[PDB]
Amino acid sequence: EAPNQALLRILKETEFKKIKVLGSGAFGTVYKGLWIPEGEKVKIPVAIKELSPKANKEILDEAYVMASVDNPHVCRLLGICLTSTVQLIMQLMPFGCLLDYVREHKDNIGSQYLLNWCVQIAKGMNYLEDRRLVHRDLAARNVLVKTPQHVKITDFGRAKLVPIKWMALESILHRIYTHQSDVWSYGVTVWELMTFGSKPYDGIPASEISSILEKGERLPQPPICTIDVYMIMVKCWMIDADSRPKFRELIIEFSKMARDPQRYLVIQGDERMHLPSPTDSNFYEDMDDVVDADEYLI
Numbered sequence: 007e008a009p010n011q012a013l014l015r016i017l018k019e020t021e022f023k024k025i026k027v028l029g030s031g032a033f034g035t036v037y038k039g040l041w042i043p044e045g046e047k048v049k050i051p052v053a054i055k056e057l058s059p060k061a062n063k064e065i066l067d068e069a070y071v072m073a074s075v076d077n078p079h080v081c082r083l084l085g086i087c088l089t090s091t092v093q094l095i096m097q098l099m100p101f102g103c104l105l106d107y108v109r110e111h112k113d114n115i116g117s118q119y120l121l122n123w124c125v126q127i128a129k130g131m132n133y134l135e136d137r138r139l140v141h142r143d144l145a146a147r148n149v150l151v152k153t154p155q156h157v158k159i160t161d162f163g164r165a166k167l168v169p170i171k172w173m174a175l176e177s178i179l180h181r182i183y184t185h186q187s188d189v190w191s192y193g194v195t196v197w198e199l200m201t202f203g204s205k206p207y208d209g210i211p212a213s214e215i216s217s218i219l220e221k222g223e224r225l226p227q228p229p230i231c232t233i234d235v236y237m238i239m240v241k242c243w244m245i246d247a248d249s250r251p252k253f254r255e256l257i258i259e260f261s262k263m264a265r266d267p268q269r270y271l272v273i274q275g276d277e278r279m280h281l282p283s284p285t286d287s288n289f290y291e292d293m294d295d296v297v298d299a300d301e302y303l304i
């Protein structure tokens with residue numbers, strides 16, 4: 007098939023600085039930082055993922071996929087730094103993951119925001135399908151928040167050309183992954199947003215999930231969801247993968263709904279709710295010459 011002419015940008019250690027730690031796990035640590043390229047007079051806010059020859063291959067596999075994407079609703083690799091550790095330089099998504107965002111801001115999250123997030127995830131996912139890329143790990147923890155109005159899909163660590171409670175039944179039973187198995191995971195992601203961050207099948211052990219799904223049990227109707235929105239989630243969980251919606255149809259369905267949000271999601275106090283916008287005071291050291299990665303192109 008088609009040659010991948012993506013550019014892998016190698017960045018010098020001296021071109022960027024680590025400010026604080028954003029999160030740390032088994033992989034290594036993610037830092038908040040600033041990238042000050044060559045003699046450009048720009049400060050790009052960045053996220054630095056810092057890490058054995060085996061782990062280096064896995065991070066270089068993530069860098070390969072992350073450098074091959076370019077969409078407004080997908081996180082791209084800005085570059086890699088080849089130190090003794092090997093670090094991925096990415097765009098700072100200052101509001102963190104969508105999962106914690108819906109949990110921390112439930113009292114200010116209205117129907118408009120929820121349906122628009124669904125449209126953006128469907129757009130990002132449809133783009134990955136265009137690029138013949140199966141995510142294999144779509145979940146609300148892997149959707150990042152640039153601004154409350156703009157979200158992006160990330161975490162290409164499993165992406166190809168195990169998270170049980172987000173997986174399609176074919177994936178649990180036969181290790182089959184398709185763009186239609188990503189649709190199942192999209193359904194679970196939506197359920198997570200609609201329940202303001204609830205854990206899917208809470209208390210149920212992962213080994214019981216396969217049997218539960220086979221019997222015909224599914225995640226319940228969130229209280230804010232009209233039958234219109236739940237019906238969509240339910241279609242994403244059909245046994246027959248081809249019977250599930252396509253991401254391009256999910257874009258259309260959620261867009262029609264986002265034009266009249268209160269007809270599809272019932273939230274007390276909706277419309278009187280407000281989240282930070284770039285049109286707010288103190289929304290955005292030296293704030294001189296800072297440009298977002300989305301505006302820094304070469």
Ligand SMILES: COC1CCN(c2nccc(Nc3cc4c(ccn4C4CCCC4)cn3)n2)CC1
Nearest residue numbers: 028029036053081096097098099100102160161
């Ligand atoms: C498992 O390793 C990583 C996979 C890639 N992910 C990513 N892709 C693009 C931009 C970005 N930037 C980003 C991430 C942020 C925050 C604030 C929190 N996080 C994550 C990582 C630390 C804990 C949650 C800001 N920007 N991150 C973050 C975690």
